[PDB]
Design a protein around this ligand. Structure first.
Ligand SMILES: [Co+2]
Ligand SMILES: [Co+2]
Lengths: 133, 133
C-alpha cells in the first residue's frame, strides 16, 4: 500500500456538514501527460479529465475540526511531480481542486457548496500514515 | 462605435508569424453571469463558453513589434467589471486568455503555437482610438 504525502488542505462545506479535501501526493501515482494550456482547455471541452488527469478519489474518513466538531475528509492524491507543478501555478491549482471536487461528487454522491479555501497553516486532516491508497 | 480600453497584451506566435492578442475591455460589452468556479468547470465540460463568456473577437490588424518587424494583432474585448475580476485572478486570467485564443483560431482559421506570455511593460499593440468594436 502507498502512503500519501501531504500537499495542501481544502476546507469546504455541504448540506451534510463540513468537508475537507486533502490534496496530497505520491511518486507512485501516474502523472498526467504534460499537455499545453491550449490542450488542457481542449481536454475539458471534450470532458476527458476523468481519464487524462490521474488521481485517487479517496474514501471518506471521519475526523474532527479545530473546534472539536465532526467533519468528513477525502484524500485526493496525484503524482508528486504534478503536485509540485500545481503548487507553482494558481491556475493549475484551482483547476485541479475544481476537478477533484467534481470527481468526489460523482463518485460518492455528494453535493458540495461552492465556497472553498486552501488552508494556510495546516497541510492534511487525518492520520497520514493510516491513509494508504 | 465603442472604443476599447487597454487591459493587457499577450505575445504569442504561429506558423504565420508573431501574433499579439490585446485583452481589452469596455463597460458596453455584456458581462458573463457571475458563476461559481464549480459552475465554470461545468460550462467548459459542456463546451458553452462561446455563448456564456461574452467577448469581441476582433479583426486582425497589421502592426509592428518593438524590432520594427511586421506582426498581427487581434483585440479581444470583454466587460470592464469582468476584466477587473480577471486581473485579480491568475486562474481566471489564464483561462480567459486560453478561451480567447481558441475563439480566434475558430473564427479566423488560425493555428497558434502554444507558448504565450503577458507583456509586463506594454498594455496594447495598435492605435487604440482607431480600434472601435
Ligand atoms: Co472547442
Ligand atoms: Co462532468
Amino acid at each position: 500500500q502507498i502512503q500519501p504525502k501531504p500537499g495542501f488542505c481544502v476546507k469546504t462545506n455541504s448540506s451534510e456538514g463540513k468537508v475537507f479535501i486533502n490534496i496530497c501526493h505520491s511518486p507512485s501515482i501516474p502523472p498526467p501527460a504534460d499537455v499545453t494550456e491550449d490542450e488542457l482547455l481542449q481536454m475539458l471541452e471534450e470532458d476527458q479529465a476523468g481519464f487524462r488527469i490521474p488521481m485517487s478519489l479517496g474514501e471518506p474518513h471521519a475526523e474532527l475540526d479545530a473546534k472539536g466538531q465532526g467533519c468528513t475528509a477525502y484524500d485526493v492524491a496525484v503524482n508528486s511531480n504534478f503536485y509540485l507543478r500545481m503548487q507553482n501555478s494558481d491556475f493549475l491549482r484551482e483547476l485541479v481542486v475544481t476537478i477533484a471536487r467534481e470527481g468526489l461528487e460523482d463518485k460518492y454522491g455528494l453535493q458540495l457548496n461552492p465556497e472553498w479555501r486552501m488552508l494556510k497553516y495546516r497541510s492534511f486532516l487525518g492520520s497520514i500514515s493510516q491513509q494508504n491508497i
